[PDB]
Write a protein that binds this ligand. Structure first.
Ligand SMILES: Cc1cc2nc3c(=O)[nH]c(=O)nc-3n(C[C@H](O)[C@H](O)[C@H](O)COP(=O)(O)OP(=O)(O)OC[C@H]3O[C@@H](n4cnc5c(N)ncnc54)[C@H](O)[C@@H]3O)c2cc1C
Length: 450
């Protein structure tokens, strides 16, 4: 292929100067929107950093404090004044616990009330991916079926917006997905996706297809397409799909999705993310030696791409329910303002990962009279034992440990608030004036062919 499909294909690895140049004006916040976004972003980030007065205590050596402490333990003021494989597995469980909501779906669900009453929602992720065998993919299938029964019984008719949903990885459902061919995927994967989706629809819960490596985008779109034309799913808007703003293709995937929502007569639940596989995408493309990268090479370009994509999503509320997944205070504030006046719950939601977003979103989800924005946030809640945790945990270490990540920079008491929540379009224009051109690749990430 269609006009929209062909256009996705042609953007696959387009030069970054080109892709970034096209995004800029789509991403630019109008003057007054930009300033309200800056102000809200500043406030959110200020409260986050300075929760237990962490910077007000910078406002006030360690040898002296130990002495002052000992002096303060003197009860009477008078007296006072007068005077390899195993270490890896273990470190994975230790660092990983904070990102895991529960070992089994019943445990995760039994703990869902606490934040659900404050206005949070959930999307449960049964951990496990990249099934290597037929038996592995069968077992993921059965754990996903079980989970949908449990979530859907706990949802109890609350529906796709207010009620919990599930997130699935297509790589978990087909053996050796990473290299699977079109005909085997449609024969084997598709019937399992279809079957899980019909079930989610019986319980009226959201079912989201997580986005994985970039060479699987095309087949995921083929799968989505067919799924959307199933008669048993006519009139039901519970199908969710993730799109990754770090891809050059993202805006073109949106044009495709908008047309698919129209043709298939539905509102798609669309989770807009930046993306989780960036380090591997770079390594992969550097090993393939092709014309370029399928993702951006500077983090700021991903930020610009997200904003441009978010505007596109928000323009079509009849066709898309945007779910804006982020832990970045500027990103959140920009979307808040871009969504305009006259919020209604079904307009959009935020999303966050368990163990990462609660502090940001405790300022967002909840009543205005408690100093909150009163916007709903859906927590992505991984569910599984230590044997399903590795790959997800590694992605979290990369996310938390990267110096370009907001969650890393916020902890840096030296980087001032204003730089942290700096507007990405303005940042790109600043680079462009310094460097001579808009959208030049990261200086340390040359094209694969070099
Ligand atoms: C609820 C939820 C669901 C998610 N589901 C998925 C999913 O299905 N598939 C998936 O891939 N991701 C998914 N993610 C996104 C991913 O897991 C990260 O959480 C997200 O990319 C971080 O973005 P941020 O705005 O919070 O942080 P920010 O710090 O503002 O942005 C961080 C990121 O920018 C990108 N980046 C980093 N360095 C560079 C660089 N040099 N050049 C270009 N881009 C760079 C990466 O995407 C990285 O995550 C999900 C996130 C959430 C919150």
């Amino acid at each position: 292929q269609s006009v929209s499909r062909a256009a996705i294909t042609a953007a696959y690895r387009r030069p970054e100067t080109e892709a970034v140049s096209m995004l800029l004006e789509q991403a630019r916040l109008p003057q007054p929107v930009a300033e309200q976004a800056h102000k809200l972003a500043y406030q959110l980030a200020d409260k986050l950093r300075n929760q237990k007065n962490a910077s007000g205590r910078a406002g006030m050596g360690v040898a002296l404090m130990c002495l002052a402490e000992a002096l303060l333990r003197i009860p009477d003021k008078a007296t006072r004044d007068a005077l390899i494989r195993k270490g890896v597995d273990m470190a994975m469980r230790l660092m990983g616990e904070q990102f895991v909501t529960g070992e089994t779906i019943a445990e995760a669900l039994a703990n869902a009330r606490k934040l659900e009453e404050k206005g949070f929602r959930y999307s449960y992720d049964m951990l496990g991916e990249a099934a290597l065998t037929a038996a592995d993919a069968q077992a993921y299938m059965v754990s996903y079926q079980q989970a949908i029964h449990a979530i859907g019984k706990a949802s109890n008719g609350r529906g796709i917006y207010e009620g919990p949903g599930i997130s699935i990885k297509l790589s978990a459902l087909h053996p050796r997905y990473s290299r699977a061919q079109y005909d085997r995927v449609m024969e084997e994967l598709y019937p399992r996706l279809k079957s899980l989706t019909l079930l989610a629809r019986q319980y009226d819960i959201g079912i989201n297809i997580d986005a994985e490596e970039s060479d699987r985008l095309e087949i995921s779109l083929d799968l989505l397409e067919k799924l959307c034309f199933e008669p048993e799913l006519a009139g039901w808007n519970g199908i969710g799909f993730v799109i990754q703003a770090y891809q050059k293709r993202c805006p073109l995937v949106i044009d495709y999705l908008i047309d698919l929502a129209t043709r298939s007569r539905r509102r798609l639940m669309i989770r807009l993310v930046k993306g989780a596989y960036w380090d591997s995408e770079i390594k992969r493309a550097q090993m393939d030696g092709l014309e370029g990268y399928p993702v951006y090479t500077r983090k700021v370009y991903t930020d610009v791409s997200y904003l441009a994509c978010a505007k596109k999503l928000l323009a079509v509320p009849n066709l898309i329910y945007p779910q804006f997944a982020t832990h970045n205070a500027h990103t959140l504030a920009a979307i808040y303002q871009l969504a305009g006046q006259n919020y209604y719950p079904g307009q959009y939601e935020f999303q966050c990962l368990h163990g990462m977003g609660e502090p940001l979103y405790e300022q967002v989800t909840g009543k205005v009279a408690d100093g909150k924005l009163n916007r709903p946030c859906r927590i992505y809640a991984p569910v599984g034992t230590h044997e399903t945790l590795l790959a997800y945990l590694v992605r979290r270490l990369l996310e938390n440990g990267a110096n370009t990540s907001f969650v890393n920079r916020i902890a840096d008491t030296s980087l001032p608030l204003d730089e942290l929540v700096a507007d990405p379009v303005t940042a790109v224009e600043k680079l462009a004036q310094q460097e001579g051109q808009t959208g030049l690749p990261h200086p340390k990430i040359p094209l694969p062919r070099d």
